């Protein structure tokens, strides 16, 4: 339930919203909004909008790289924890009010994975 099938592909950028990832693969897969890593970058400049309200947005940029910029290993990708969402959902409650996001839905961002 933690991870989904997937081709890993080498990540275009090693950084994500300012952060350095340590791994070097990835998939487009979780991303619903983009059909390539072109679009991912695309996708997170829009998002680096949210720079503007500064709590929400250090809250967000790790799950925000955790859908965009996921890990990649063995043809698997790891999803965003249940954990990692429902913090998020408190500084970010005001912004946006995605809706899997504002429920943290379970399929989305299940509960139990090793990364949380
Ligand atoms: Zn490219
Ligand atoms: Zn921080
Ligand atoms: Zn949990
Ligand atoms: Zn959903
Ligand atoms: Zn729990």
Same mark, same amino acid.
């Given at each position: 339930?933690?991870?989904? /099938?997937?081709?890993?592909? =080498?990540?275009?950028? $090693?950084?994500?919203? &300012?952060? +350095?990832? =340590?791994?070097?693969? /990835? @998939?487009? +897969?979780? *991303?619903?909004? @983009?059909?390539?890593?072109?679009e991912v970058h695309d996708k997170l400049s829009?998002?680096? &909008?949210?720079? $503007? *309200? =500064?709590?929400?947005?250090? *809250?967000?940029?790790?799950?925000?790289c955790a859908v965009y910029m996921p890990k990649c290993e063995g043809g698997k990708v790891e999803l965003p924890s249940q954990g990692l969402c429902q913090t998020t959902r408190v500084p970010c409650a005001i912004v946006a009010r995605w809706p899997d996001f504002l429920k943290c839905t379970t399929d989305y961002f299940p509960e139990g994975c090793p990364n949380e």
């Open positions: 339930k933690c991870k989904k /099938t997937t081709t890993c592909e =080498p990540l275009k950028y $090693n950084i994500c919203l &300012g952060s +350095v990832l =340590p791994y070097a693969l /990835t @998939s487009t +897969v979780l *991303a619903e909004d @983009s059909s390539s890593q072109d829009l998002w680096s &909008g949210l720079r $503007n *309200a =500064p709590r929400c947005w250090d *809250a967000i940029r790790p799950l925000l």
